[PDB]
Design a protein around this ligand. Structure first.
Ligand SMILES: [Mg+2]
Ligand SMILES: [Mg+2]
Ligand SMILES: [Mg+2]
Ligand SMILES: [Mg+2]
Ligand SMILES: [Mg+2]
Ligand SMILES: [Mg+2]
Ligand SMILES: [Mg+2]
Ligand SMILES: [Mg+2]
Ligand SMILES: [Mg+2]
Ligand SMILES: [Mg+2]
Ligand SMILES: [Mg+2]
Ligand SMILES: [Mg+2]
Ligand SMILES: [Mg+2]
Ligand SMILES: [Mg+2]
Ligand SMILES: [Mg+2]
Ligand SMILES: [Mg+2]
Ligand SMILES: [Mg+2]
Ligand SMILES: [Mg+2]
Ligand SMILES: [Mg+2]
Ligand SMILES: [Mg+2]
Ligand SMILES: [Mg+2]
Ligand SMILES: [Mg+2]
Ligand SMILES: [Mg+2]
Ligand SMILES: [Mg+2]
Ligand SMILES: [Mg+2]
Ligand SMILES: [Mg+2]
Ligand SMILES: [Mg+2]
Ligand SMILES: [Mg+2]
Ligand SMILES: [Mg+2]
Ligand SMILES: [Mg+2]
Ligand SMILES: [Mg+2]
Ligand SMILES: [Mg+2]
Ligand SMILES: [Mg+2]
Ligand SMILES: [Mg+2]
Ligand SMILES: [Mg+2]
Ligand SMILES: [Mg+2]
Ligand SMILES: [Mg+2]
Ligand SMILES: [Mg+2]
Ligand SMILES: [Mg+2]
Ligand SMILES: [Mg+2]
Ligand SMILES: [Mg+2]
Ligand SMILES: [Mg+2]
Ligand SMILES: [Mg+2]
Ligand SMILES: [Mg+2]
Ligand SMILES: [Mg+2]
Ligand SMILES: [Mg+2]
Ligand SMILES: [Mg+2]
Ligand SMILES: [Mg+2]
Ligand SMILES: [Mg+2]
Ligand SMILES: [Mg+2]
Ligand SMILES: [Mg+2]
Ligand SMILES: [Mg+2]
Ligand SMILES: [Mg+2]
Ligand SMILES: [Mg+2]
Ligand SMILES: [Mg+2]
Ligand SMILES: [Mg+2]
Ligand SMILES: [Mg+2]
Ligand SMILES: [Mg+2]
Ligand SMILES: [Mg+2]
Ligand SMILES: [Mg+2]
Ligand SMILES: [Mg+2]
Ligand SMILES: [Mg+2]
Ligand SMILES: [Mg+2]
Lengths: 51, 156, 222, 148, 185, 53
RNA sequence: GAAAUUGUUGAAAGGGAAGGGCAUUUGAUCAGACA
RNA sequence: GGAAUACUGCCAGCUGGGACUGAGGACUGCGACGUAAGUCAAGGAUGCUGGCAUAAUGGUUAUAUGCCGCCCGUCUUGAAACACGGACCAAGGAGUCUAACGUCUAUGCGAGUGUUUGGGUGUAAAACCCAUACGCGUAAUGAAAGUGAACGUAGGUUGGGGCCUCGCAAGAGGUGCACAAUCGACCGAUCCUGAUGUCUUCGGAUGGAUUUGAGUAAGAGCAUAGCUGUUGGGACCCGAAAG
RNA sequence: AAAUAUGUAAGAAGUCCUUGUUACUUAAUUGAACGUGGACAUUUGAAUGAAGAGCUUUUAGUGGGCCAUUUUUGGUAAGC
């Protein structure tokens, strides 16, 4: 009789999609990606800053 | 007959209500409303009166008093959304106030108990007020908007 | 007569399995998506390290909004706008990109705005404005059994299964996407950018492929 | 009756449902069957091919009566025997005694041969017969006796 | 607005009760729309519609057309249903037994059937014996044997019979009906 | 195409299924890594107005 | 004993027509529902 | 070398102010929180408090004020038109009835149908009853003389609802009315063919043909009634100059 | 020799095997047409859509048109 927005009614959010509970519990929406440091070839940098 | 009469009548059975889902949960008050805080009364009989806040009652109202001997306002209920909570604050650790609830204002002039309750509270408070100079005078004088005052700007 | 709780038991328990299945499935896709996204990120970087260039695959899925009202429209575009189910302004549908639809898009550019939608805007499109076609009618999604009922034949028994089919352009995208009733957006909240809609995006207008800038818009209309 | 009629419904609309432009006027195409060969020829050839001009012989003072001659096919035939009597003759199909049917007395003038009669013998009295009728009749061991 | 792609507020175009005003007809319909809603048997669904049919879409099935249908291979014991009147036909000389279930039987038909020791059943008696229409053989009559349809599609080279009152030589057999008078058809 | 569709089918069926023999439109192309090695980018700009005539 | 149209009485409004629509002030006037 | 920050994007991160709405009316669903009992914001508002209990709210009306609003009817591509009729008001004031019809529909009976020219009868223009004919239908085709509808289970083929059989089901087969397509057979016309025979010119079997018919091929009509349509009638109403 | 327009095709009324009918046709049971019997199901044969599709009867009004972008004829031109 009345459509309820999962995006802003936590109950039906958890009704569709049970993963919402664990997503939120594991923050997950702010995941810290692996810190790696590959550096680009000077080819790349040269031609980026070329004329 | 003047008019035929229908083939169908309504039942006159009232239905029952659907079982509603509306829990009465408690009113958390805005942070500026701690007891001891001085309120400006925005409306009502004692509008623009400056007044000490004492207790949050169970009907959400606020218990205030003048004190009565200062500015003539008695122990009273006031509605939180008609009230500017100032930033100036008396301690209220010496004011009992337990006694005071909704039933205490059951309509049903003035009861001697009220007149005495008023005195016991007000004395604790006055004792306190006197600690900070000019507060009493403050408390005893109506607030108003002076030309140029811009509420959405002033700090209270 | 039993049943009371007896066949209430046969079912609530049965319902519980089904959620578990969804719980592990939606947990799956989360992995699916992250490591997909990350792999591309690492692709780019790996190729730069190597003095090369990682050119992403072209997008296989777009999202079209009809942007033009209903009158004064040539017949060829018209038909197409119907076949893509855009028959009123600000309504939108998903389209799988191949040569044979790509041309269709080409044909209606003056009248639409379209682009590559993100996971985020497909999710919020589906969660809020997403309705099924069920012996016609157009039924809100809002419970997962509505989907399993009609889309379950194809795998697909949750609102997130739906989203997952769309975004990855699954083997059963036709059924999954046709099931979706044309989304009905409001006009953009922020406004349109632009003072005139009916030039191409590129010329300061609103229509055409505007690529990843389609999410900014759709969100303001969803 | 008038109350069910569409002029009741047109009351209050100007043109009585016959157009503002092209009115309802007296006789636009002419009267009657006017123009059959001119402005009404498309309707005539198509819908009435054959209409204009002549064929065959005139016959002055033709008297339909002369040619009176209703057909009855074998198709019925057994109908001209009353039911009761009929069943009685079907069973006991035989020379020596077979039913006499005066088809003139039933007011037909020719027996034609539409389709199958059981093998029972009939004696059939008629003014005329198709070759087939008379053939099919003998094939059941009946005959045709010519009357008038 | 909506670029419509289909005419709005369209009526499905199917009779949905009969136009007839007969109590009894309405009751038979009461019977069968119940059976059609609660028996998933296609027969009940077909019969319900046939009851709405106007007189024309209900040509009379004959007793001889009935007798033939029973000479169908493996069909001689079936009960023929006819949603309409059933007429007699002197042209058949031998009639089977069986059980015809119908709206009306003419005097001659009901006799012929009963004379060979058959049964004439009304559709509602038919229902009580065959609620799923078991073992029934539905027949319909010739719709396009009507005189009217002769004249449908009248035009050049269609061969369809003039709407004509008097007929004979010199009633529409000349110019445009033969090579020697203008042209032909 | 039929003659061939009959082939790929028999060739499949009596092996261990997996067919796919409807036609499909041009798919968009996939990812790819273009190398620079042998082929650094040359940089063009636009050219001025001229008249040759 | 209608209407056009008229006299009187009462009330109103009126800076080169009048009448109308949405809305509310103001005056006048009134139904219902309370128990 | 190591940070920051901007920019863009994400979060099923938290959170404040404001507005409109509160359809529904026992329960039934999907859920959420809880060790649990319970609880809940989970298939649509309840709780608490006050004021009035009447012109207070509301309706009607006149006026005032803001914005807006050209005279309707008509013919026209286009009218508020410097196009026409209309000063005002009442009362009359225009698609009818009839003969014969098409399509559709309802009803009666059905290879038939139609009592009402007439007769009988009557509580008298009614109602009730009826013999003989007639009409239309049940046969067509030829200008005519004239001839006249089964090779066959009243045909083969393809689709076909429904039904029948098998199968738990999906499906598979059997039969298949209406209807549609297609190829054939039958009757008349036309044109070939011309047996047995003959009051030697009659007779016309039989088998055929890019021909042809408003035909056969297990009948569908007859009658009353209605809306719409058709023709003739003063013919929707008013109108000539004329004869 | 374009662009725009435009014909057909994308299967069950389909493809393959076996070998019947005739007065047509072949030097020829050769062919042509129509068949009987057998082999293979929905990735059965591109996309997108499909408030379904097909069919039948009868009848109104209408048969002065005007405008805009583009193509365009006559005219110096025109609110032609
Ligand atoms: Mg509750
Ligand atoms: Mg709170
Ligand atoms: Mg004082
Ligand atoms: Mg699409
Ligand atoms: Mg915004
Ligand atoms: Mg704004
Ligand atoms: Mg903003
Ligand atoms: Mg502008
Ligand atoms: Mg929004
Ligand atoms: Mg009439
Ligand atoms: Mg009347
Ligand atoms: Mg009426
Ligand atoms: Mg009307
Ligand atoms: Mg009216
Ligand atoms: Mg009108
Ligand atoms: Mg009309
Ligand atoms: Mg007029
Ligand atoms: Mg004539
Ligand atoms: Mg006959
Ligand atoms: Mg006939
Ligand atoms: Mg000719
Ligand atoms: Mg008088
Ligand atoms: Mg007044
Ligand atoms: Mg007003
Ligand atoms: Mg309510
Ligand atoms: Mg309610
Ligand atoms: Mg009072
Ligand atoms: Mg009152
Ligand atoms: Mg009051
Ligand atoms: Mg006024
Ligand atoms: Mg104005
Ligand atoms: Mg005019
Ligand atoms: Mg003019
Ligand atoms: Mg003018
Ligand atoms: Mg004039
Ligand atoms: Mg005048
Ligand atoms: Mg007037
Ligand atoms: Mg009048
Ligand atoms: Mg009497
Ligand atoms: Mg008399
Ligand atoms: Mg009598
Ligand atoms: Mg007599
Ligand atoms: Mg006759
Ligand atoms: Mg006839
Ligand atoms: Mg002769
Ligand atoms: Mg004749
Ligand atoms: Mg064949
Ligand atoms: Mg079958
Ligand atoms: Mg078969
Ligand atoms: Mg012939
Ligand atoms: Mg001829
Ligand atoms: Mg005829
Ligand atoms: Mg007339
Ligand atoms: Mg005169
Ligand atoms: Mg005169
Ligand atoms: Mg004269
Ligand atoms: Mg094309
Ligand atoms: Mg589809
Ligand atoms: Mg549909
Ligand atoms: Mg028409
Ligand atoms: Mg017309
Ligand atoms: Mg016309
Ligand atoms: Mg005209």
């Amino acid at each position: 009789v009345l459509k309820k927005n999962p995006l802003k009614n936590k109950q039906v959010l958890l009704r569709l999609n049970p993963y919402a509970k664990v997503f939120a519990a594991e923050k997950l929406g702010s995941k810290k990606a692996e810190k790696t440091g590959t550096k680009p070839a000077a080819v790349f940098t040269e031609t980026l800053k070329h004329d | 007959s003047a008019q035929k009469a229908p083939k169908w009548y309504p039942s006159e059975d009232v239905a029952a209500l659907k079982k509603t889902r509306k829990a009465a949960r408690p009113q958390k008050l805005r942070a500026s409303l701690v007891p001891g805080t001085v309120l400006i009364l925005l409306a009502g009989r004692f509008r623009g009166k400056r007044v000490v806040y004492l207790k949050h009652l169970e009907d959400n109202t606020l218990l205030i008093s003048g004190p009565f001997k200062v500015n003539g306002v008695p122990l009273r209920r006031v509605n939180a959304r008609y009230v500017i909570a100032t930033s100036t604050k008396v301690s209220v650790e010496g004011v009992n106030v337990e006694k005071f609830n909704v039933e205490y204002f059951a309509k049903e002039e003035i009861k001697a108990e009220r007149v005495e309750d008023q005195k016991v509270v007000d004395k604790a408070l006055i004792a306190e007020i006197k600690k900070t100079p000019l507060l009493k005078q403050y408390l005893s004088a109506s607030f108003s908007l002076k030309n140029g005052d811009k509420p959405h700007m002033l700090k209270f | 007569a039993e049943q009371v709780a007896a066949e209430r038991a046969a079912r609530k328990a049965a319902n519980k399995e089904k959620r578990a299945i969804i719980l592990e499935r939606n947990a799956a896709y989360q992995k699916e998506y992250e490591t997909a996204e990350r792999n591309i990120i690492q692709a780019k970087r790996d190729a730069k390290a190597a003095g090369s260039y990682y050119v992403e695959a072209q997008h296989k899925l777009v999202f079209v909004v009809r942007i033009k009202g209903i009158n004064k429209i040539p017949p060829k575009p018209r038909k197409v706008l119907q076949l893509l189910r855009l028959t009123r302004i600000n309504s939108g549908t998903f389209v799988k990109v191949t040569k044979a639809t790509l041309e269709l898009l080409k044909l209606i550019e003056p009248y639409v705005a379209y682009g590559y939608p993100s996971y985020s805007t497909i999710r919020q499109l589906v969660y809020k404005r997403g309705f099924g076609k069920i012996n016609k009618q157009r039924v809100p999604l809002s419970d997962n059994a509505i989907i399993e009922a009609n889309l379950g034949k194809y795998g697909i028994l949750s609102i997130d299964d739906l989203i997952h089919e769309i975004i990855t352009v699954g083997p059963h995208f036709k059924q999954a996407n046709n099931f979706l009733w044309p989304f009905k957006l409001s006009n953009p909240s922020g406004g349109w950018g632009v003072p005139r809609k009916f030039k191409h995006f590129i010329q300061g207008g609103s229509f055409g492929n505007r690529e990843e800038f389609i999410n900014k818009l759709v969100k303001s209309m969803n | 009756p008038s109350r069910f009629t569409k002029t009741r419904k047109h009351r209050g609309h100007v043109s009585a449902g016959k157009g503002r432009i092209g009115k309802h006027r007296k006789h636009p195409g002419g009267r009657g069957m006017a123009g059959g060969q001119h402005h009404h020829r498309i309707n005539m050839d198509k819908y009435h091919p054959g209409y204009f001009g002549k064929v065959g012989m005139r016959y002055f003072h033709k008297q339909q009566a002369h040619f009176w001659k209703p057909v009855l096919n074998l198709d019925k035939l057994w109908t001209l025997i009353p039911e009761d009597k009929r069943d009685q003759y079907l069973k006991s199909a035989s020379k020596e005694t077979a039913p006499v049917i005066d088809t003139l007395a039933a007011g037909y003038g020719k027996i034609l041969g539409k389709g199958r009669i059981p093998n029972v013998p009939v004696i059939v009295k008629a003014r005329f017969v198709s070759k087939l009728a008379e053939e099919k009749i003998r094939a059941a061991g009946g005959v045709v006796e010519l009357i008038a | 607005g909506i670029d419509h792609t289909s005419k709005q507020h369209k009526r499905s175009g199917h009779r949905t009760a009969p136009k007839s005003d007969n109590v009894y007809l309405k009751l038979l319909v009461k019977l069968y729309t119940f059976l059609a809603r609660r028996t998933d048997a296609p027969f009940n669904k077909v019969v319900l519609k046939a009851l709405f049919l106007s007189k024309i879409n209900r040509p009379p099935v004959s007793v001889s057309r009935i007798a033939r249908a029973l000479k169908q291979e493996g069909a001689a014991n079936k009960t023929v249903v006819v949603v309409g009147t059933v007429t007699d036909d002197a042209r058949i000389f031998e009639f089977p037994k069986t059980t015809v279930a119908a709206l009306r039987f003419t005097a001659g038909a009901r006799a012929k059937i009963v004379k060979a020791g058959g049964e004439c059943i009304t559709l509602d008696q038919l229902a009580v014996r065959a609620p799923k229409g078991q073992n029934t053989l539905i027949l319909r009559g010739p719709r396009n044997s009507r005189e009217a349809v002769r004249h449908f599609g009248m035009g050049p080279h269609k061969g369809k019979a003039p709407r004509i009152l008097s007929t004979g030589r010199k009633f529409e057999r000349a110019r445009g009906r033969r090579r020697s008078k203008g042209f032909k058809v | 195409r039929v003659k061939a569709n009959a082939a790929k089918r028999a060739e499949a069926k009596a092996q261990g299924v997996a067919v796919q023999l409807k036609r499909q439109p041009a798919q968009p192309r996939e990812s790819r890594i273009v190398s620079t090695e042998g082929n650094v980018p040359q940089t063009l700009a636009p050219v001025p107005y001229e008249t040759f005539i």
